[PDB]
């Protein structure tokens, strides 16, 4: 159905609001982490007060519309926002009301720690560190689990994993629906009674996200163990990036990406490249400096290097600035830092995916090619060559990024100045980086921002790519080429 698409869109907007709100609370406090979790919880409660949560009444059993298997989350409260799990410190979430059941409570969602069948231990009677301290009782969550076994209730499983990411200390991934097919009384070596439940996954679902996670990680540590064939080359960047760029092909013998000369940063025409002024933020850019004024009164990034909102042009600090490398206004000049993979595909010629988790608003890499003037572009274009026009990239799908107007009534969007559009062209037929293998899509998960750092010509800003949402590993990256 297309109502499915409508659900997915609603979820998209909800997540954009949540992450924007979090980031705002962080900017507010930092103007004056372990702060991450508290701010996440606050964002949650604020969204709750504004009636912005999904599945608020918990009356939904089984799939949450718009939330798909493999979706990743960074906080427990976030799961409450998306209606997946309503108890951020408890393993079992349950609904007292009755459909099947008879007003009898039934478990609708469980949180499972990482180490398909799951041997799940009931809750209750533990200390502050979760250590069993008394006999469990068949009440609340446990009784609800029992009842869900009895009534054959579809139970959502969300797996929690200590997983590398830049927003929190863990990753929560939705693994879909399981059924409880057995339950029993069991004893630990402590001697306390506990309840155990055997969970089995429902047949015919998409691959679990936790499997994809472990797979990606393994690709970072020992790729040949899971992919003994396919890897043509483990760095086509060929040491020109600070991280290796994988090249994978398990379909045929084509090795085209090898035949380009890798170019990590866009090459501007010789004889463009000095006079400009820098800020004096010797402890890093905060508020009220010159570079902020250059950015219409708002520094593009938060203190975690994350894009706050889209802008027509980003002025990063350069050599004229007295801020150190750790300054929050020096994001894209760091270059690629994520491990990416250019892989053969059928529907697209080649595609790009990330081995790492990518969070909403995070910088991925530059879109690097050979930049032309209008004369040079014209000459190559009269010969028949095809050129890329960065002005045609569309990020309009994610323009609500940073919008807090649904949470804060008094919110006004900071100015997005009307400037002349970029008009230069890029050739990527000879020299290019990983980003040039990114496929086209009307529903992109990557946005474009024009950035200046190394030079100060408005006519020739760099093309920098940012993750538009929380992208789990192995998800293909896409751009709207327009
Ligand atoms: Zn500054
Ligand atoms: Zn600075
Ligand atoms: Zn500066």
Q: Where are the domains of the chain?
A: 1-207, 208-482
Tell whether 289 is in a known binding site. yes
Measured in Å, residue 323 CA sits from the centre of ligand 1 at 7
> What is the C-alpha to C-alpha distance for residues 386 and 392, in angstroms, rounded to an integer?
14
Cited resolution, angstroms:
2.4
The pair phi, psi for residue 13, each rounded to 5°, is -60, -40
Half-sphere exposure for 302 (CA within 13 Å, toward CB): 23
3-30 helix and 35-49 helix, angle to the nearest 10 degrees: 130
Tell whether 365 is in a known binding site. no
Tell whether 323 is in a known binding site. yes
> What is the C-alpha to C-alpha distance for residues 477 and 352, in angstroms, rounded to an integer?
6
> What is the C-alpha to C-alpha distance for residues 148 and 94, in angstroms, rounded to an integer?
9
Measured in Å, residue 418 CA sits from the centre of ligand 1 at 23
Q: 3-state secondary structure string, 215-278?
A: HHHHHHHCHHHCCCCCEEECCCCCCCCCCCEEEECCCCCCCHHHHCEECCCCECCCCCCCCCCC
Measured in Å, residue 292 CA sits from the centre of ligand 3 at 8
- List of long-range contacts for 373-377, beta carbons under 8 Å, 24+ apart: 373/269, 373/424, 374/423, 374/424, 376/269, 377/424, 377/425
> What is the C-alpha to C-alpha distance for residues 395 and 401, in angstroms, rounded to an integer?
10
Note the ligand closest to the C-alpha atom of 289.
1
CA distances from 394 to 171, 266, 330, 364, 416 (A): 30, 20, 24, 17, 16
Residue 452: helix, strand or coil by DSSP?
A: strand
Q: How far, in whole angstroms, is CA 290 from its chain's centroid?
A: 31
Residue 212: helix, strand or coil by DSSP?
A: helix
Token pair 């997540």: residue: 15
Measured in Å, residue 324 CA sits from the centre of ligand 1 at 10
- Residue 240 near residue 229, CB atoms below 8 Å: no
Furthest CA-CA distance within the chain: 83
Q: Please provide the DSSP assignment of 361-392 as one string.
A: T-EEEE---EEE-HHHHHHHHHTT---B-GGG
Breaks in the chain (C to N over 2.5 Å), named by the residue before each, are: 32, 115, 273
Note the ligand closest to the C-alpha atom of 319.
3
Provide the CATH number for the domain formed by 208-482 in this structure: 2.170.270.10
Ramachandran quadrant class, 124 (left: phi over 0; alpha: psi -120 to 50; beta: rest): left
CA distances from 406 to 27, 97, 327, 380, 386 (A): 18, 30, 31, 48, 43
Instruction: Please list, in sequence order, all residues whose beta carbon lies within 8 angstroms of the beta carbon of residue 50, skipping any fewer than 6 positions away.
Output: 406, 407
Q: Among 125, 62, 48, which residue's Cα sits nearest to residue 90?
A: 125
Q: Which residues surround ligand 2, an ion (CB under 5 A)?
A: 281, 285, 317, 323, 327, 329
- The radius of gyration of the chain from alpha carbons, rounded to an integer in Å, stands at 25
CA angle (322 as vertex; 455, 360 as ends), nearest 5: 65
Residues comprising the chain, all counted: 482
Instruction: Please list, in sequence order, all residues whose beta carbon lies within 8 angstroms of the beta carbon of residue 465, skipping any fewer than 6 positions away.
Output: 363, 364, 365, 366, 367, 435, 438, 446, 447, 448, 449, 479
> What is the C-alpha to C-alpha distance for residues 473 and 357, in angstroms, rounded to an integer?
5
Method underlying the structure = X-ray
Measured in Å, residue 284 CA sits from the centre of ligand 2 at 5
Note the ligand closest to the C-alpha atom of 280.
1
Tell whether 80 is in a known binding site. no
Q: What are the residues facing 86 on neighbouring strands?
A: none
Q: Among 353, 355, 357, 293, which residue's Cα sits nearest to residue 329?
A: 293
CA angle (268 as vertex; 262, 270 as ends), nearest 5: 110
């Amino acid at each position: 159905p297309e109502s499915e698409r409508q659900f997915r869109e609603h979820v998209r907007k909800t997540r954009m609001i949540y992450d924007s709100l979090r980031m705002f609370l962080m900017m507010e406090e930092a103007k004056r982490r372990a702060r991450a979790d508290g701010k996440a919880g606050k964002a949650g409660s604020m969204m709750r007060d504004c009636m912005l949560w999904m599945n608020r009444d918990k009356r939904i059993v089984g799939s949450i519309p718009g939330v798909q298997v493999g979706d990743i989350f960074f906080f427990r409260f976030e799961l409450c926002v998306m209606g997946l799990h309503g108890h951020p410190q408890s393993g079992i979430d349950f609904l007292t009301g009755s459909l099947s059941s008879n007003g009898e409570p039934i478990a609708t969602s469980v949180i499972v720690s990482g180490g398909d069948v799951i041997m799940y231990t009931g809750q209750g009677g533990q200390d502050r560190l979760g250590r069993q301290a008394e006999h469990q009782r068949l009440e609340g969550g446990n009784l609800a689990m029992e009842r869900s076994m009895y009534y054959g209730i579809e139970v959502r499983v969300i797996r929690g994993l200590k997983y590398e990411n830049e927003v929190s200390s863990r990753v929560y991934v939705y693994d879909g629906l399981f059924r409880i097919v057995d339950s029993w009384f069991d004893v630990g070596k402590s001697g306390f009674g506990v309840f155990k439940y055997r969970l089995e996954r429902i047949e015919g679902q998409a691959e679990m996200g936790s499997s994809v996670l472990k797979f990606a990680r393994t690709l970072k540590t020992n790729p040949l163990s899971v992919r003994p064939r396919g890897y043509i080359n483990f760095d086509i960047s060929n040491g020109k990036e600070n991280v290796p760029v994988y090249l994978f092909n398990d379909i045929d013998s084509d090795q085209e990406p090898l035949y380009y000369e890798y170019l990590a940063q866009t090459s501007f025409p010789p004889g463009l490249f000095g006079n400009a002024s820098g800020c004096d933020c010797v402890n890093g850019c905060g508020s009220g400096c010159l570079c902020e004024a250059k950015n219409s009164g708002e520094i593009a990034y938060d203190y975690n290097g994350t894009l706050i909102r889209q802008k027509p042009l980003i002025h990063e600090c350069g050599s004229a600035c007295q801020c150190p490398p750790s300054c929050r206004n020096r994001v894209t000049q760091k270059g690629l830092r994520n491990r990416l993979e250019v892989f053969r595909s059928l529907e697209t010629g080649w595609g790009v995916r990330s081995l790492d988790v990518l969070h909403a608003g995070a910088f991925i890499c530059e879109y690097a090619g050979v930049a032309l003037t209008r004369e040079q572009a014209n000459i190559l274009t009269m010969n028949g060559d095809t050129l890329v026009y960065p002005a045609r990239f569309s990020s309009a799908r994610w323009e609500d990024w940073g919008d807090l107007s649904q949470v804060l009534a008094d919110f006004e969007r900071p100015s997005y100045p009307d400037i002349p559009p970029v008009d230069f062209a890029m050739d990527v037929s000879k020299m290019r980086n990983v980003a040039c293998y990114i496929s086209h899509s009307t529903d992109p998960n990557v946005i474009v921002q024009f950035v200046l750092h190394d030079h100060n010509s408005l006519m020739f800003p760099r093309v920098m790519l940012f993750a538009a949402e929380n992208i789990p590993p192995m998800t293909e990256l896409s751009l709207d080429y327009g």
